[PDB]
Design a binder for this molecule. Structure first.
Ligand SMILES: *[C@@H]1O[C@H](CO[C@@H]2O[C@@H](C)[C@@H](O)[C@@H](O)[C@@H]2O)[C@@H](O[C@@H]2O[C@H](CO)[C@@H](O[C@@H]3O[C@H](CO)[C@@H](O)[C@H](O)[C@@H]3O)[C@H](O)[C@H]2NC(C)=O)[C@H](O)[C@H]1NC(C)=O
Ligand SMILES: CC(=O)N[C@@H](CC(=O)O)C(=O)NC[C@H](CC1(C(=O)N[C@@H](Cc2ccc(O)cc2)C(=O)O)CCCC1)C(=O)O
Ligand SMILES: *[C@@H]1O[C@H](CO)[C@@H](O[C@@H]2O[C@H](CO)[C@@H](O)[C@H](O)[C@H]2NC(C)=O)[C@H](O)[C@H]1NC(C)=O
Ligand SMILES: *[C@@H]1O[C@H](CO[C@@H]2O[C@@H](C)[C@@H](O)[C@@H](O)[C@@H]2O)[C@@H](O)[C@H](O)[C@H]1NC(C)=O
Ligand SMILES: [Cl-]
Ligand SMILES: [Mg+2]
Ligand SMILES: [Zn+2]
Length: 607
């Protein structure tokens, strides 16, 4: 380990602590860069060596956090909570939380090594038919999004969940135990309590539950409307109009957003096709076009363009050489104020264009706070980081903006078109809310011990049925580990940030649309080229995590807390139209036949 990274001696008061933080931030950048660098080398090129090197960097990060956490505890443990500087209090409190650095060396290794193997299992798992084999991205993704054959969707869903989940379960149990051991020594009951602490809100869970209560009626009506369409397509044998929807029919491996079945549920298919994918292909869009168009939206707001290091270093397409990569999209900050990259196996589709904006939102954030000290190089909270790119994508997806960028012949500003659009947006945003809420409900119960290995799948499907109103299309038992077939579980990425951001982004949109001078319906707003909006947004991004998110938020939108009303205001028209459609069809809202599962196809898996 480098002496130049080990902590110096500082006076045991706030003045010495202010110098202590500078020296910490100084050396942390070198440590963070070598960790990010090695993760990148592995994720863009999965090999045992790159895994080894990634784990060495992880160990080194842990030695660094140990030394500096120790020093901080011996110097300021009794006095840092009383400092006047609140940003210093933030920094110090962070440094004294050692996480996996609380582990002994032998368990530090095992922990670092589980992450490598869980990541490899997920990102290299394949579904084989009988020579060739399908990967999740693009093969199974495209099947789930476009196939309307019940048996083919089933084969892809079952094959994926079996291939990814079953091998992960034994590893995930070991990881959970080690993670908990680590964070207990920081004073957390369990890792989940640490994750939740990032929101600095004593009533976090209660506040989330109250939000979900306001949003659930919207989901239930969307659910019932979509269920009716699936009933017509697949028959009474496979769809129960009073039961949960089979989990493989909603356009997505995790049933988590439904925009890919828009063409099965669009009420007015004569009107312009608001899925512009066919046009993007007809026009010959490529990955680089998509990132350049996203970039230009950011620069239209007088935010920063992507630096040369981004274009030279990013991986914007799935490699064609015989290489295995983590295709799950990600945005990378190397903590050197120079290098920022996206790794995305970009496909030419409309929902990938949204993803491009999402990931570039992360980069923009990185660029706007790169001069802050490291500990503040985060979103106000993790939900803020996830909302930035999605907010811009709300403007991009409006039919008026799509027209501006040549992807849609201008649509009539009528009601059939307004409903078509808000419905597509509901499929993308409202359908996600139960899933965004339930994933960390599951993981919080695993970390707390409420959900032992013996109930991993039982409790996962309890939650999936409770919240999303779906059911597995084949029988599952505790040999299956269906939570593990979702990227964020083996890759240990928390999820509640996405529930937070799916609500928050509509608060941001409203603030920015009002600040842009817009006045029509909130869902037709396009903040493109509004430099006033760009300024309001730029203030948030530069704040990093220096001020409480409740303060940053108050400055931007007028409230200091999450609020569903902007979301509700955005969807008002289709919320009403959906209720009417379901009443006219005599739908039951919900899934009272909660035990119901569909039958197998006759010749399955044959033919
Ligand atoms: C599309 O058309 C709407 C008109 O609203 C329509 O309502 C239904 C009957 C259907 O025809 C729908 O297809 C359609 O949405 C336009 O919305 C209207 O825009 C004007 C000016 O932009 C708004 O005036 C403002 O109103 C606010 C709120 O009162 C005031 O604070 C302002 O001072 C200003 O006077 C008007 O309110 C707004 N109406 C509604 C219901 O939102 C929309 O602009 C138009 N868009 C496009 C792209 O053509
Ligand atoms: C080095 C590193 O890991 N960096 C972090 C960022 C950071 O911490 O700075 C990061 O890049 N994480 C990747 C993750 C990828 C995506 C994701 O997983 N999304 C959720 C939920 C969702 C769905 C629709 C949507 O519009 C928005 C969110 C899912 O698909 O299930 C996949 C495409 C979209 C975002 C991400 O960017 O959030
Ligand atoms: C993926 O990583 C491997 C290492 O695991 C790289 O293989 C090394 O490549 C260099 C340069 O060609 C050689 O000097 C080493 O001997 C190789 N080591 C091994 C273990 O193969 C490989 O080049 C990387 N692939 C890409 C596309 O970057
Ligand atoms: C768990 O489930 C595994 C999968 O096999 C079966 O597949 C469907 C078609 C039904 O037959 C259902 O009984 C099973 O899900 C089994 O191999 C395994 O034996 C089951 N039990 C355990 C303890 O893993
Ligand atoms: Cl989070
Ligand atoms: Mg999709
Ligand atoms: Zn994100």
């Amino acid at each position: 380990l480098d002496p130049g990274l080990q902590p110096g001696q500082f006076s045991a008061d706030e003045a010495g602590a202010q110098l202590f933080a500078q020296s910490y931030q100084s050396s942390a950048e070198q440590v963070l860069f070598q960790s990010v660098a090695a993760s990148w080398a592995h994720d863009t090129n999965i090999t045992a060596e790159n895994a080894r090197r990634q784990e060495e960097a992880a160990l080194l990060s842990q030695e660094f956090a140990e030394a500096w956490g120790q020093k901080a505890k011996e110097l300021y443990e009794p006095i840092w909570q009383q400092f006047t500087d609140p940003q210093l209090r933030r920094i110090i409190g962070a440094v004294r939380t050692l996480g996996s650095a609380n582990l002994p060396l032998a368990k530090r290794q095992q922990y670092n090594a589980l992450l490598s193997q869980m990541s490899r299992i997920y990102s290299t798992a394949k579904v084989c038919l009988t020579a060739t084999c399908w990967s999740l991205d693009p093969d199974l993704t495209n099947i789930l999004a476009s196939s309307r054959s019940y048996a083919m969707l089933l084969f892809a869903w079952e094959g994926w969940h079996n291939a990814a989940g079953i091998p992960l379960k034994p590893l995930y149990e070991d990881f959970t135990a080690l993670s908990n051991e680590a964070y207990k020594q920081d004073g957390f009951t369990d890792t989940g309590a640490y994750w939740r602490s990032w929101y600095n809100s004593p009533t976090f869970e209660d506040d989330l539950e109250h939000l979900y209560q306001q949003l659930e009626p919207l989901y239930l009506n969307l659910h019932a409307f979509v269920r009716r369409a699936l009933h017509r397509r697949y028959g009474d044998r496979y769809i129960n109009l009073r039961g949960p929807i089979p989990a493989h029919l909603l356009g997505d491996m995790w049933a988590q957003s439904w925009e890919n079945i828009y063409d099965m549920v669009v009420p007015f298919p004569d009107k312009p096709n608001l899925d512009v994918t066919s046009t993007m292909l007809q026009q010959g869009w490529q990955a680089t076009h998509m990132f350049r168009v996203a970039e230009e939206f950011f620069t239209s707001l007088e935010l920063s363009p992507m630096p040369p290091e981004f274009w030279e270093g990013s991986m914007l397409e799935k490699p064609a050489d015989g290489r295995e990569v983590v295709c799950h999209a990600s945005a990378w900050d190397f903590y050197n104020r120079k290098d920022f990259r996206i790794k995305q196996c970009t496909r030419v589709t409309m929902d990938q264009l949204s993803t491009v904006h999402h990931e570039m939102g992360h980069i923009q954030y990185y660029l706007q706070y790169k001069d802050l000290p490291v500990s503040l190089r985060r979103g106000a909270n993790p939900g803020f980081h996830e909302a930035i790119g999605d907010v811009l994508a709300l403007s991009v997806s409006t039919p008026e903006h799509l027209h501006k960028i040549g992807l849609l012949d201008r649509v009539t500003n009528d009601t059939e078109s307004d409903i078509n659009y808000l419905l597509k947006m509901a499929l993308e945003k409202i359908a996600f809310l139960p899933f965004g809420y339930l994933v960390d409900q599951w993981r919080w119960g695993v970390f707390s011990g409420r959900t032992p290995p013996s109930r991993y799948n039982f409790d996962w499907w309890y939650l999936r049925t409770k919240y999303q109103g779906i059911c597995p299309p084949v029988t599952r038992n505790e040999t299956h580990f269906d939570a593990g077939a979702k990227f964020h579980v083996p890759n240990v990425t928390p999820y509640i940030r996405y529930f937070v951001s799916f609500v928050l982004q509509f608060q941001f949109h409203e603030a920015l649309c009002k600040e842009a001078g817009y006045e029509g319906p909130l869902h037709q707003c396009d903040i493109y080229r509004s430099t006033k909006a760009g300024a309001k947004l730029r203030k948030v991004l530069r704040a990093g995590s220096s001020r409480p998110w409740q303060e940053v938020l108050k400055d931007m939108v007028g409230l200091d807390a999450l609020d569903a009303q902007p979301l509700l205001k955005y969807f008002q028209l289709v919320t009403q139209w959906l209720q009417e459609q379901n009443q006219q069809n005599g739908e039951v809202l919900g899934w009272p036949e909660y035990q119901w599962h569909p039958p197998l196809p006759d010749n399955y898996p044959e033919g």
